[PDB]
UniProtKB/Swiss-Prot annotation, chain E:
It is found in: Plastid, Chloroplast thylakoid membrane. PsaA and PsaB bind P700, the primary electron donor of photosystem I (PSI), as well as the electron acceptors A0, A1 and FX. PSI is a plastocyanin/cytochrome c6-ferredoxin oxidoreductase, converting photonic excitation into a charge separation, which transfers an electron from the donor P700 chlorophyll pair to the spectroscopically characterized acceptors A0, A1, FX, FA and FB in turn. Oxidized P700 is reduced on the lumenal side of the thylakoid membrane by plastocyanin or cytochrome c6. Belongs to the PsaA/PsaB family. This is Photosystem I P700 chlorophyll a apoprotein A2. The chain crosses the membrane at residues 2-28, 50-72. It comes from the Eukaryota.
Swiss-Prot record, chain G:
The keyword Magnesium does not apply. Binds 2 [4Fe-4S] clusters. Cluster 2 is most probably the spectroscopically characterized electron acceptor FA and cluster 1 is most probably FB. Its EC number is 1.97.1.12. It is found in: Plastid, Chloroplast thylakoid membrane. InterPro entries: 4Fe4S_Fe-S-bd, 4Fe4S_Fe_S_CS, PSI_iron-sulfur_center, PSI_PsaC. The eukaryotic PSI reaction center is composed of at least 11 subunits. Apoprotein for the two 4Fe-4S centers FA and FB of photosystem I (PSI); essential for photochemical activity. FB is the terminal electron acceptor of PSI, donating electrons to ferredoxin. The C-terminus interacts with PsaA/B/D and helps assemble the protein into the PSI complex. Required for binding of PsaD and PsaE to PSI. PSI is a plastocyanin/cytochrome c6-ferredoxin oxidoreductase, converting photonic excitation into a charge separation, which transfers an electron from the donor P700 chlorophyll pair to the spectroscopically characterized acceptors A0, A1, FX, FA and FB in turn. This is Photosystem I iron-sulfur center. It comes from the Eukaryota. The lineage of its organism: Eukaryota, Cryptophyceae, Pyrenomonadales, Pyrenomonadaceae, Rhodomonas.
Length: 742, 60, 139, 147, 74, 161, 80
């Protein structure tokens, strides 16, 4: 029983004393401010626990309680989304008429004329149109009334109180010891089996006993208040049998392994529900049940307290061949003693999963009536692409912090890390070459096309009409997925997604999904994507691999993760740290995700979204101009940015005038950021000297001596305002455009 | 000057030029800069003490 | 005094961070030191190497790489028996550090002061007086 | 609208002058680098000590004021050109009404007058304004490369 | 008319920046404080902090209120 | 009137501004039933719009060709409520804030740790200072003439040149 | 090469010599200060211009001053 619970009782006293002493957590800051830099230095390093404390136990305790605090904030946020849906929304009107009422769960107060933002969203309601897709989530859950939304808001509030209590309790009353946190096998067993498997299983039970009957009654056309309450499905099996007759047999088919009895509600239909334009909820129920079994089985892999199971260290140490030295030896010790190494992995995975979520949710729209709510589809794609890109760059930020701080060569002799660092010149030179080749042969095709179109030579272009770059591999994969139902997935009835090919799905005379054809423009923008992803990897990988030392600075690890430079010598070593590669790689992340969301926005408006009409023909939002105009830069400038900025710039005096104002405000903030990015600290310190003189003249100089921001903070302020302004401008443009036309 | 006295700095390249410091000690050797002066403001380097010559320091 | 070229080197598996063509055609630097143990250190050019018990010898491209390793060994393993040499492609070896047997931060007799200016930094000459004149700005 | 743009021009003139004057008067010395005259006009910095000294030279104040000069002549020529093209149509009231807020400058000057320029070539052909249409994109490229 | 106005205003802005740049080069390189004791030039350097602080004030006074009136109208 | 402008009460374009602004609200009100909350809200807006235009018409503002009220700021007394009187109100509040902050900075200099008083403010003493600002012109001018506002040039640190 | 100067305000704290990554500076005897020693710069051909010496110095304006000059293979820090 070496996996055991071990707790220190009453470690830290619940006192307001250290609240009154800002900077108490570090020896430098606790002696008080003398310059304004102290103030910035206070906020910058506060959650950097391993810079204040030496011991891994106290660091682990602070992290566990901070995770409860984050959970409390998320639960309060969810409770507020449910409360605003219950109290300030037109959810009931939306349930009666989804394809006509526009969701709105935010109402403004009348103060300075701002009540113009309460536009006519429909259903006898005035408010701000919301695009988070909560209404479709609630309808998929089977909510059907505001009263149940009040109970969900209360459940969120109770959970939020329980998490903030638990964070206090587990830091101040009962803090686990380090040997409790250093149980990776136990934690994985419980998080796979218990967190994921039970979670999937419990959700599958809700879908089978609540979501599936309520939604079958809704899609038959029954009014929401005419639908029986969800517990009458739980007790009276006769009504559930009337909807799905397999329930007449109960749990005998489950236990005797006669599982094909349950095919009424555990289907493998594929495709979309024609009524709602969403995934079949019988498919999602079978999906969650299948995942639950796999996750619970996965949870029995690792050894905890009874001899069955794997040792994770033995698995890692056995995988070594003739190219890779000692192999994965020493990685277990890293990943159970370094929090930063774990955060680097988990941030890269969370970001990757968020980008996958973004792709899978527009192509296989899971919620009822979310496919034809085009503002929601554009919003949730753009949001999860930005979360993915940010989390992916934070994985490289904390890989750099690991290398600078937690990496020790004595325990990493001739293993995989040692070998990567010992051929990092070959890695970065080959990646650098790939980024040059791929920028020439992706963006230079655009420059070739602009020049030929400008010269009158349209036969010399890379286009469908002229020289053709055909995405043959992607077209072939689309063919395979269209041929799959009945062939390589024989029990499937429809394709996984209509994007691959097949029918046009229309809901409320709007296209839910239809095949997304690929041509020369799709080949070109996909290689644009491959190029922007490659260089972002190069900037972040070069920062992680050269974080400790280079040919330039042989002792970079002694300066730390975040230092501004090592002086003007050696020609100049400005921005040589690992932090400065995270700083430079967030710009290239911004560039990559901006072209991805622009590609999505133009391609869906041009070729997928639109209104079905007589004869079955479809009129798209921008009328199929992507194919012949996404091949030049002038086409993107004119037919995408200029043509679609009409709604944001003409929005004044309407309910979308808020987007019109945020468009300008973010354009302003973006420009304001370049003051911090193009300038240097020394100018601003000398300007502050003359302003200090004028304060000295009037005897009003402060005792906290004003300083220009540090070199690193100047870079961080410039990057933060750059990201805010660029993303905010895209946010305002995307939302005003798709609310007006979609 | 004397220890514990208040002085106005007259070194034009000092951070504390024309400000008041306090005399810490005065060397008696053949030192070029024998007067030790402490200040309440820190310089750009975060130092709050410096050596000065008598000519560089004036009593207030 | 002179570099005994036959001294065994620390065990190392090789890396791409080592020296290039300019080392065999312009100059290379060498560092030697005595170790009481057979222990792992970090190379200035890359990953980890293992120093052999007794006397070790390395070749690096920059003098700063030799001094970065020397500071690392002194703090980590308390080794101060390090000698840094400059070696030219003619075969001539130039002893570099510590230059007169004593470390620079410890005073020694017979050291002559180079670069010392008799006044404080604000007593320099303005650029205009020394314009079209060879006279130096340091007074 | 002419009142508001004249005050913006005055702000730009004062700010460009501030950087250039501060650069000239702090050229010989400051509190960060009191011996700045021994190093010349154009030097990179004095290193990361004393808090950091990036852009401390008088040349760097020329560098910083060049952006403000470009901004100033931008506001002046945008004003001249919008007021004159609206008078040349006979539609001076379009400038009179739209110049008092910034969205009028964004949609009624930049966006409205962009359309003949960005249609100099398109998938339907080209005309003699194609060369300016290319130079326009060329200008957007070099500017961004400067970043 | 548009090209000629734009051309000569851009030339003007470049010439005006260059005048101040070469005044800075004058102070660094050619200015001798001992041949200019208590001149107009030396007294400029004697109250440079006042000129820079006042220029900082007028720029903020113009900037806060011009941007404020424009944003108000918007 | 002044500078070829028209008083807003008789300019016809101000009247068209009011009429177009009310038709814009009435066409939104035409989609709702009488006692509903959107109908009540829009009627409140129509009344507020009419009140604003009526008040501006009788205030002595001068509309332009556009029909939007213009402000005269050359100093004439018939238009002092548009810049001169709001300006006097501003300078009183701004001088109050400046005088009160200066008084607290001088108090905080005489403290045990002067920099702790500025990130952790002594609220009773700072409220004592915020109350004193109502007679800042007299207090600040007496401060000036008694040689306590302006410090002499040789107690101020300056750059070498 | 870069030119490194030591002015007579040096208090002999030896901080510049310990901070120098390229062994440019050393301590020599001098009766001017209380510590009895002053920094010296005999090996400025090896100076890379990092200015770590200037960061280490505690006198009000730096006793050690580095003046970046002509660039060489040594002062550029080039291992190629
Ligand atoms: C967590 C997310 C969240 C968000 C973003 C919002 C956002 C909003 N809510 Mg909702 N709300 C939420 C959760 C949320 N709510 C929850 C959980 C509940 C259930 C209790 C409600 C119940 C609710 C009601 C009943 C109403 C709103 C309303 C509003 C709107 C105006 C709020 C306002 O101005 O009041 C401002 C109110 C104040 C008292 C101002 C307080 C400002 C202080 C100074 C903030 C200071 C924080 C403090 C200093 C932190 C440090 C602590 C200290 C010890 C130092 C706004 C759109 C209003 C609305 O929609 O009207 C149409 C409304 O009437 N909310
Ligand atoms: C079945 C057991 C189980 C479950 C469900 C969890 C669940 C969780 N752990 Mg883990 N953990 C476990 C065992 C378990 N742990 C063991 C044995 C160890 C020791 C090795 C740890 C050590 C550990 C650490 C060190 C950390 C976690 C964290 C977390 C949270 C991850 C963030 C997240 O997704 O939360 C959001 C998702 C939710 C579903 C929120 C649910 C909240 C409650 C707690 C879930 C369980 C409630 C209860 C069982 C359900 C009753 C159902 C009933 C109505 C029928 C999550 C609540 C992290 C964290 O955030 O700490 C707070 C963290 O830092 N765990
Ligand atoms: C954690 C998830 C969860 C939870 C709490 C429940 C809870 C319940 N299920 Mg459900 N169920 C689930 C998952 C879940 N189920 C899954 C994943 C499946 C798919 C295999 C089913 C399929 C299912 C069927 C087919 C039936 C239930 C029934 C029931 C009830 C049990 C009554 C009983 O023992 O007699 C069962 C009957 C016998 C003859 C024995 C109870 C309300 C039964 C019920 O009362 O229907 C409303 C019922 O007939 N469940
Ligand atoms: C699960 C996620 C997670 C976690 C736990 C951490 C945790 C940590 N990170 Mg990592 N990081 C993450 C995600 C995460 N980060 C991501 C996604 C990125 C990519 C951008 C990074 C990039 C990164 C870098 C580059 C650095 C860290 C550092 C740190 C540490 C110090 C935190 C601190 O004191 O900040 C205090 C928090 C603040 C000062 C908050 C201000 C940040 C922005 C500007 C405010 C947010 C703006 C807001 C959302 C929008 C405003 C609205 C506007 C319209 C007004 C801590 C270990 C630092 C370190 O040195 O650690 C050793 C460090 O240098 N991280
Ligand atoms: C429009 C602006 C712009 C442009 C063109 C570039 C261009 C480049 N950047 Mg830079 N960058 C920019 C903005 C820009 N950046 C900004 C704003 C930042 C701020 C954070 C950075 C930060 C940054 C970093 C940190 C990195 C780059 C890298 C790169 C290179 C990518 C490799 C490549 O595509 O080579 C191909 C070149 C191009 C696509 C440029 C256009 C050339 C086209 C095809 C036309 C060629 C015309 C031809 C030569 C004419 C010949 C005749 C003529 C001479 C007369 C390339 C040199 C990366 C790098 O060097 O890795 C390789 C890298 O690590 N950049
Ligand atoms: C849109 C872009 C932009 C803006 C607004 C500014 C603004 C300014 N610059 Mg910068 N600058 C920029 C771009 C920009 N610059 C670029 C690209 C460069 C080239 C590198 C420079 C280079 C530069 C130099 C070299 C100098 C300036 C100076 C100035 C000031 C001159 C105007 C003035 O004095 O009052 C205008 C004041 C403002 C515009 C401030 C706005 C008021 C704010 C937004 C209040 C809002 C508070 C709000 C509630 C906060 C919300 C926070 C949220 C988290 C809640 C001002 C701070 C000069 C200076 O500092 O003069 C003293 C100066 O020396 N700038
Ligand atoms: C650009 C320079 C400028 C300046 C500095 C002023 C300044 C002034 N003008 Mg204006 N004015 C100007 C140009 C200018 N004007 C132009 C170009 C015209 C168009 C011809 C006018 C037309 C004008 C009129 C028609 C009037 C003024 C008045 C005034 C005075 C009223 C302010 C006050 O309260 O003082 C006086 C009050 C006190 C000292 C104490 C009050 C408590 C003030 C001195 C008014 C005035 O009284 O004239 C002297 C007045 O009736 N001005
Ligand atoms: C109450 C304190 C106070 C006082 C009396 C002054 C007084 C002055 N300032 Mg300073 N200033 C202050 C705070 C103060 N400042 C703060 C907090 C900042 C940081 C934002 C600055 C930044 C600053 C700059 C950058 C400039 C001045 C300038 C000036 C002068 C002209 C007026 C002006 O331009 O206002 C401008 C005011 C600001 C830019 C910021 C004021 C912010 C608030 C409104 C005031 C501070 C409130 C404070 C918290 C009071 C608390 C009181 C309480 C404890 C009882 C004048 C000498 C200018 C100058 O040198 O002209 C010759 C100039 O260029 N100030
Ligand atoms: C940086 C620097 C350091 C030192 C050296 C340095 C190079 C010298 C210096 C550079 C300094 C620089 C670059 C200085 C630049 C200085 C400039 C641009 C000065 C502009 C002067 C314009 C004047 C006086 C216009 C007067 C018009 C009038 C009076 C019109 C009057 C009127 C008439 C007759 C007709 C209309 C009615 C009214 C209005 C009555
Ligand atoms: C303007 C500028 C400054 C000066 C900026 C300063 C001193 C910031 C001071 C602004 C006030 C004092 C606080 C700002 C508060 C704002 C109202 C917004 C607050 C945002 C949150 C932090 C609260 C630098 O120090 C600098 C350094 C390096 C490169 C570029 C620059 C640079 O561009
Ligand atoms: S410029 Fe700023 S960053 Fe680059 S070296 Fe000089 S100081 Fe370090
Ligand atoms: S600049 Fe660098 S190399 Fe040169 S003396 Fe100073 S610390 Fe040594
Ligand atoms: S130059 Fe500065 S750091 Fe070096 S010994 Fe002298 S006082 Fe110390």
């Amino acid at each position: 029983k070496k996996v055991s619970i071990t707790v220190d009782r009453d470690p830290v006293a619940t006192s307001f004393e250290k609240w009154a002493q800002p900077g108490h957590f570090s020896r430098t800051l606790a002696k008080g401010p003398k310059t304004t830099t102290w103030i910035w230095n206070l906020h910058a390093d506060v959650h950097d626990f391993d810079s204040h404390t030496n011991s891994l136990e106290d660091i682990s305790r602070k992290i566990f309680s901070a995770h409860f605090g984050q959970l409390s904030i998320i639960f309060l946020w969810l409770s507020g989304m449910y409360f605003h849906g219950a109290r300030f929304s037109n959810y009931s009107a939306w349930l009666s008429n989804p394809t006509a009422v526009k969701p709105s769960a935010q109402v403004v107060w009348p103060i300075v004329g701002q009540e113009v933002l309460n536009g006519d969203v429909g259903g006898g309601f005035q408010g701000v149109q919301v695009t988070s897709g909560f209404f479709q989530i609630w309808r998929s859950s089977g909510i059907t009334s505001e009263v149940e939304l009040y109970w969900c808001a209360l459940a969120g509030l109770i959970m939020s109180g329980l998490m903030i209590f638990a964070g206090w309790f587990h830091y101040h009353k009962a803090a686990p010891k380090l040997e409790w946190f250093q149980n990776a096998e136990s934690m994985l067993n419980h998080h796979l089996s218990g967190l994921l498997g039970l979670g999937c299983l419990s959700w599958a039970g809700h879908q089978i006993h609540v979501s599936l009957p309520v939604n079958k009654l809704l899609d038959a056309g029954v009014a929401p208040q005419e639908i029986p309450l969800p517990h009458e499905f739980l007790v009276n099996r006769d009504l559930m049998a009337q909807l799905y007759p397999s329930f007449s047999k109960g749990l005998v088919p489950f236990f005797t392994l006669n599982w094909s009895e349950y095919s009424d509600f555990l289907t493998f239909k594929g495709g979309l529900n024609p009524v709602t334009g969403g995934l079949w909820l019988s498919d999602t129920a079978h999906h969650h049940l299948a995942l639950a079994v796999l996750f619970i089985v996965a949870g029995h892999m690792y050894r905890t307290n009874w001899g069955i199971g794997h040792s994770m260290k033995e698995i890692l140490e056995a995988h070594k061949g003739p190219f890779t030295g000692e192999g994965h030896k020493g990685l277990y010790e890293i990943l159970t003693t370094s929090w930063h190494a774990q955060l680097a992995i988990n941030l890269a995975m969370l970001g990757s999963v968020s980008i996958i979520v973004a792709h899978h949710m527009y192509a296989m729209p899971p919620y009822p009536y979310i496919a034809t709510d085009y503002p929601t589809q554009l919003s949730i794609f753009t949001h999860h692409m930005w979360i993915g890109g940010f989390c992916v760059c934070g994985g490289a930020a904390h890989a750099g912090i690991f290398m600078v701080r937690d990496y020790n060569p004595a325990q990493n002799y001739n293993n995989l890390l040692d070998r990567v660092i010992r051929h990092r010149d070959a890695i970065i030179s080959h990646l650098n070459w790939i980024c040059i080749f791929l920028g020439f042969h992706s963006f230079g095709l655009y420059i070739h096309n602009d020049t030929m179109r400008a010269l009158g030579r349209t036969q010399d272009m890379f286009s469908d009409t002229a020289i053709q770059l055909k995405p043959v591999f992607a077209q072939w994969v689309q063919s395979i997925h269209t041929l799959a139902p009945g062939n390589t997935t024989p029990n499937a009835l429809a394709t996984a997604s209509y994007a691959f090919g097949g029918d046009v799905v229309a809901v409320g005379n709007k296209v839910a999904m239809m095949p997304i054809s690929l041509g020369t423009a799709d080949f070109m923008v996909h290689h644009i994507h491959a190029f922007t992803i490659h260089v972002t990897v190069l900037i972040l990988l070069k920062g992680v691999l050269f974080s400790r030392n280079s040919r330039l600075i042989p002792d970079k690890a002694n300066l730390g993760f975040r230092f501004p430079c090592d002086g003007p010598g050696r020609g100049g070593t400005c921005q040589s740290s690992a932090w400065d590669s995270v700083f430079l790689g967030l710009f290239w992340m911004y560039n990559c995700i901006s072209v991805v969301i622009f590609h999505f926005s133009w391609k869906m408006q041009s070729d997928v979204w639109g209104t079905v009409q007589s004869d079955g023909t479809v009129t798209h939002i921008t009328g199929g101009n992507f194919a012949q105009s996404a091949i030049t830069i002038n086409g993107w400038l004119r037919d995408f940015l200029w043509a679609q900025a009409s709604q944001v710039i003409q929005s004044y005096g309407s309910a979308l005038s808020a987007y019109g104002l945020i468009f300008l405000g973010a354009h302003f903030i973006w420009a304001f950021s370049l003051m911090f990015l193009f300038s240097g600290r020394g100018y601003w310190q000398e300007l502050i000297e003359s302003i200090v003189w004028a304060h000295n003249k009037l005897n009003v100089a402060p005792a906290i001596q004003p300083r220009a921001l540090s070199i690193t903070q100047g870079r961080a302020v410039g990057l933060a305002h750059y990201l805010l302004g660029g993303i905010g401008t895209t946010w305002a443009f995307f939302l005003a455009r798709i609310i007006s036309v979609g | 000057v004397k220890r514990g006295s208040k002085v106005r700095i007259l070194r034009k390249e000092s951070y504390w030029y024309q400000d008041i410091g306090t005399v810490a000690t005065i060397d008696t050797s053949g030192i070029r800069y024998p007067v030790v002066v402490r200040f309440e403001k820190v310089s750009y380097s975060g130092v709050n003490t410096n050596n000065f010559s008598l000519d560089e320091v004036v009593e207030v | 005094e002179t570099l005994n070229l036959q001294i065994p080197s620390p065990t190392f598996e090789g890396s791409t961070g080592g020296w290039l063509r300019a080392a065999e055609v312009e100059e290379k630097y060498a560092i030697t030191w005595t170790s009481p143990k057979e222990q792992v250190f970090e190379m200035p050019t890359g990953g980890a190497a293992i120093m052999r018990q007794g006397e070790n010898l390395l070749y690096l491209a920059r003098k700063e790489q030799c001094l970065a390793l020397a500071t690392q060994v002194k703090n980590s393993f308390k080794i101060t028996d390090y000698k840094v040499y400059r070696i030219f492609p003619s075969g001539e070896v130039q002893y570099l550090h510590p230059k007169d047997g004593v470390f620079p931060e410890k005073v020694n007799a017979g050291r002559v002061g180079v670069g010392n200016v008799s006044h404080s930094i604000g007593k320099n000459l303005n650029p205009a007086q020394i314009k079209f004149t060879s006279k130096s700005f340091n007074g | 609208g002419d009142f508001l743009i004249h005050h913006a021009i005055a702000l730009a003139l004062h700010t460009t002058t501030l950087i250039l004057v501060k650069g000239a008067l702090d050229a010989r010395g400051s509190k960060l680098m009191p011996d700045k005259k021994d190093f010349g006009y154009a030097f990179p910095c004095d290193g990361p000590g004393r808090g950091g000294t990036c852009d401390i030279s008088a040349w760097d104040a020329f560098y910083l004021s060049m952006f403000w000069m470009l901004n100033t002549i931008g506001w002046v020529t945008f004003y001249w050109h919008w007021k004159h093209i609206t008078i040349w149509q006979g539609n001076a009231g379009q400038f009179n009404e739209s110049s008092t807020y910034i969205m009028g400058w964004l949609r009624d000057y930049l966006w409205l007058n962009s359309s003949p320029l960005i249609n100099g070539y398109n998938p339907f052909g080209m005309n003699s304004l194609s060369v300016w249409s290319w130079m326009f994109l060329f200008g957007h490229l070099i500017w961004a490369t400067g970043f | 008319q548009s090209a000629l106005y734009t051309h000569h205003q851009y030339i003007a802005g470049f010439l005006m920046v260059g005048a101040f740049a070469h005044g800075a080069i004058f102070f660094v390189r050619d200015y001798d404080p001992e041949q200019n004791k208590n001149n107009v030039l030396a007294r400029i350097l004697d109250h440079k902090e006042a000129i820079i602080s006042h220029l900082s004030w007028v720029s903020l006074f113009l900037g806060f209120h011009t941007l404020g009136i424009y944003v108000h109208n918007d | 009137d002044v500078a070829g402008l028209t008083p807003c009460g008789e300019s016809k374009e101000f009247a068209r501004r009011l009429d177009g602004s009310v038709k814009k609200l009435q066409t939104r009100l035409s989609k709702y039933e009488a006692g509903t909350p959107p109908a009540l809200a829009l009627q409140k807006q129509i009344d507020k719009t009419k009140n604003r235009f009526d008040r501006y018409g009788k205030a002595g503002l001068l509309c332009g060709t556009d029909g939007l009220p213009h402000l005269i700021t050359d100093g004439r007394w018939t238009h002092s409520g548009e810049f001169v009187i709001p300006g006097l109100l501003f300078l009183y509040v701004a001088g109050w804030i400046g005088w009160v902050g200066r008084s607290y900075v001088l108090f905080a200099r005489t403290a045990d740790k002067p920099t702790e008083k500025e990130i952790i403010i002594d609220v009773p003493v700072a409220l004592s200072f915020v109350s004193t600002g109502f007679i800042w012109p007299f207090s600040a001018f007496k401060e000036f003439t008694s040689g306590n506002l302006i410090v002499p040039a040789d107690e101020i640190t300056v750059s070498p040149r | 090469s870069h030119s490194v100067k030591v002015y007579d305000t040096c208090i002999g704290c030896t901080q510049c010599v310990r901070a120098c990554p390229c062994d440019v500076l050393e301590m020599v005897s001098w009766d001017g200060c209380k510590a009895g020693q002053i920094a010296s710069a005999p090996r400025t051909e090896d100076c890379i211009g990092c200015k770590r010496c200037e960061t280490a110095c505690p006198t009000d304006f730096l006793s050690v001053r580095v003046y970046l000059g002509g660039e060489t293979t040594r002062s550029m820090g080039l291992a190629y």
